[PDB]
Design a protein around this ligand. Structure first.
Ligand SMILES: CC(=O)SCCNC(=O)CCNC(=O)[C@H](O)C(C)(C)COP(=O)(O)OP(=O)(O)OC[C@H]1O[C@@H](n2cnc3c(N)ncnc32)[C@H](O)[C@@H]1OP(=O)(O)O
Ligand SMILES: CC(=O)SCCNC(=O)CCNC(=O)[C@H](O)C(C)(C)COP(=O)(O)OP(=O)(O)OC[C@H]1O[C@@H](n2cnc3c(N)ncnc32)[C@H](O)[C@@H]1OP(=O)(O)O
Ligand SMILES: [Br-]
Ligand SMILES: [Cl-]
Ligand SMILES: [Cl-]
Ligand SMILES: [Cl-]
Ligand code: NI
Lengths: 159, 159
């Protein structure tokens, strides 16, 4: 199994929706209701909305939107925004059957390599407090909890 | 997520084949070709062979064959054989998406509970040496490597 990381493009659109869909249903099974999850996929992962985000990510050096490809098949992605020279990790999702093999770590490491060349010295993120899978992945990659906001924990890592 | 463990019945055969298929295709992906793995399902997990093993389990003879059910649907199994005073753990597999939530440990421990009642003082197993997933689970549950055989490590646990 060979993993390549690169900028997403519009040909990745349909497979990106399926990855998201599968990851959300699996990751949030004990956490959000079925309906919440389907509304979220239908709204946040519509063709039109994602297309616009993919195109934005293409021309904007302060938006990193990368896919993980396992033998040429898209199986995960990561989204980060840089504003005032600080990073926000907005999104990181793999297909469930591709978790626990450091592909997520690889996506994070590619992002941080780009942050490093830009001079970003801080990255924040929101993770749901019951998402033990995500939350523990971040604490194992140097993120610390600084605050809570509703049902999320706010985490930060310094560079 | 309500997990129930109980002996397999003939009713479970069809769903047992699909769990076997999917777990095996995932577990051995980096180790054997896709085609070889499929060939196993036709042969060792033929309808008839499995039925016979399910019935012997049901009849309380040399087979112990238990399933893990998530809200009434089969998502994993454990298969052991007893000979003389010893158990051999033949098979233990979950659907990939149901891994890493202690459902495997539940199966093992339910099996061990039935083994302690039958007086069995020793369990051995053969795990492919490149199967980190299985090997690490086993060493985290008291099993130790005693030997190798072909492509496998032989592990043992004493009661
Ligand atoms: C801002 C946000 O987007 S928050 C949402 C984060 N995304 C998710 O939770 C979606 C579902 N999960 C995933 O996509 C992935 O598991 C990620 C991205 C969170 C982590 O990537 P992975 O490549 O799976 O993790 P990686 O292999 O680098 O590290 C493994 C660690 O992550 C966690 N983890 C990864 N996969 C699993 C799994 N299947 N079951 C339980 N824990 C897991 C564990 O803490 C593990 O450490 P351990 O070995 O001590 O158990
Ligand atoms: C005798 C034989 O049949 S050998 C065949 C063994 N079976 C397999 O390898 C099939 C694929 N895997 C599975 O079906 C399951 O992972 C089992 C049956 C091996 C273990 O059951 P689970 O309920 O998943 O394990 P449980 O949650 O109790 O224990 C977790 C540990 O198992 C391992 N593990 C479980 N799931 C995963 C995963 N998705 N990725 C990597 N490691 C995993 C790790 O060692 C983990 O330890 P960690 O928390 O330090 O990472
Ligand atoms: Br909800
Ligand atoms: Cl999202
Ligand atoms: Cl809480
Ligand atoms: Cl070796
Ligand atoms: Ni783990």
């Amino acid at each position: 199994m060979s993993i390549e990381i690169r900028k997403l493009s519009i040909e990745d659109l349909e497979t990106l929706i399926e990855v998201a869909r599968e990851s959300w249903k699996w990751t949030y099974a004990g956490i959000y209701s079925e309906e919440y999850i389907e509304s979220w996929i239908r709204e946040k992962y519509s063709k039109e909305k994602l297309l616009n985000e993919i195109v934005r990510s293409q021309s904007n050096l302060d938006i990193l939107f990368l896919g993980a490809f396992a033998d040429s098949t898209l199986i995960g992605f990561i989204e980060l925004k840089i504003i005032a020279n600080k990073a926000e990790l907005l999104r990181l999702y793999l297909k469930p059957e591709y978790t626990h093999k450091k592909i997520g770590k690889t996506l994070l490491l590619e992002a941080e390599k780009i942050m490093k060349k830009k001079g970003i010295l801080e990255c924040r993120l929101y993770v749901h407090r019951q998402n033990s899978v995500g939350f523990s992945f971040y604490y194992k990659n140097g993120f610390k909890v600084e605050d809570t906001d509703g049902s999320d924990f706010i985490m930060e890592k310094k560079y």
